[model samples]
Target: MKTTRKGLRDGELEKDTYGRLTCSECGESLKKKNDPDEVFSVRICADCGREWKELR
Candidate 1:
């Protein structure tokens, strides 16, 4: 698993004009899901099912 910050830094993720984070490979906007157990939220790509933890 990778953090959203790291994904962005590594060019695995990108933000569009609407400021939505997208998967570089699939070009799909990530969906944000709140996680009660973790300190960060979970961002997932609906197309690939890849996950990235995003800092709150």
Candidate 2:
């Protein structure tokens, strides 16, 4: 998994008009689900089934 920072830098992700992180192509806000074990939060795209991990 890659960090949210990397995803943004690589153009795989972007902030939408609502100031939320979204997938560039799908234009859907990334859904976030917290995990107790991992040090970062997991973000999933509802449209494309893509995943991104963000540092907390």
Candidate 3:
């Protein structure tokens, strides 16, 4: 998995009008998950099943 920042830089991710993270490939927004034991959140793209990490 890659970091959200890298995804954005690599043109795999983008922001919509509302500033929500979106997958550039399908123009779909990403879903987020948090783990109790981790300091970062996982971001998922429903369309392509790609994942990225976002640090707090």
The global C-alpha lDDT for each of the candidates, from Candidate 1 onward, is 0.78, 0.76, 0.77
Best by TM-score: 3
> TM-score, each model?
0.62, 0.65, 0.68
- Which of candidates 1 and 2 reaches a greater TM-score? 2
Which regions of candidate 2 are displaced past 4 Å? 17-19
lDDT score at residue 56, model 2, on the 0-100 scale: 50
RMSD of 2: 2.3
Off by over 4 Å in 1: 16-20, 24-28
- Residue-wise C-alpha lDDT for candidate 3, range 1-56, written one tens digit per residue: 68889998999888778766678888766788767876776778877877887664
Clash statistics: count for each candidate = 0, 0, 0
TM-score rank order: 3, 2, 1
Model 2 poorest ten-residue lDDT run: 14-23
In model 1, where is the ten-residue run with the lowest total lDDT?
47-56
lDDT of 1 at 40: 69
Q: Between candidates 2 and 3, which one is better according to lDDT?
A: 3
Candidate order (lDDT): 1, 3, 2
Cα error, residue 6 of model 2, in Å, equals 1.3
Candidate 3 has a TM-score of 0.68
Per-residue CA lDDT of model 1 for 1-56, tens digit only, reads 58888999998787678766778888866778877788766779888767887664
